[PDB]
Amino acid sequence: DKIIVMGGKNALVDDAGFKMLMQYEKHNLSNLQKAYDLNLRDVADLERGFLEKPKQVEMGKKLEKKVKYFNEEAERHLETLDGMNIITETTPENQAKRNREKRKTLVNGIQTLLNQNDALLRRLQEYQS
């Protein structure tokens, strides 16, 4: 298919590129909902108070670390969705007259030089014979 380009900041994407990322992001969200569900639960347990106060404090620690991490992921992905621009590519032969003329000037320019250079080479290869 086609095009995707992220420099980490803003992202350039085309139709198939956009469908692709929405795939990846939709999935990523599903993973976030799973991660959230697991933490909402563990937190709910820890709350109960099922033995060993010191073990509970260490647990909250790990959890509080996890929720925070979650928050970083979530925000990063949302940053992504927001800096995602859709592009459409237009081919040389389908560009504005102004652009076509600019290229042609140059193509003709180069083409003439290959002809002349060819002739030059054959003039060179002759003499040295």
Side-chain angles (χ1 to χ4, degrees), residues 41-64:
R41 272 152 47 189
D42 295 313
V43 166
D45 292 359
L46 163 68
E47 272 187 351
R48 294 185 307 168
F50 269 35
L51 304 184
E52 280 36 291
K53 188 178 184 177
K55 182 167 191 173
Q56 294 199 299
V57 182
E58 295 189 3
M59 267 303 292
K61 248 50 185 161
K62 305 198 170 193
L63 288 186
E64 185 186 1

Side-chain angles (χ1 to χ4, degrees), residues 64-108:
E64 185 186 1
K65 184 182 178 179
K66 284 191 178 177
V67 302
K68 287 191 163 72
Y69 176 67
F70 182 89
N71 174 278
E72 308 296 53
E73 291 291 294
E75 292 186 359
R76 171 177 311 109
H77 295 301
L78 172 63
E79 204 102 21
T80 296
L81 300 176
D82 292 332
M84 190 162 117
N85 294 175
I86 291 185
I87 56 179
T88 53
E89 53 181 355
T90 312
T91 275
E93 72 185 327
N94 292 155
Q95 306 183 186
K97 166 71 70 180
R98 265 54 180 170
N99 290 151
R100 290 201 310 260
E101 296 304 84
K102 276 190 179 69
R103 176 176 68 273
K104 291 186 179 175
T105 293
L106 295 185
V107 173
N108 287 343

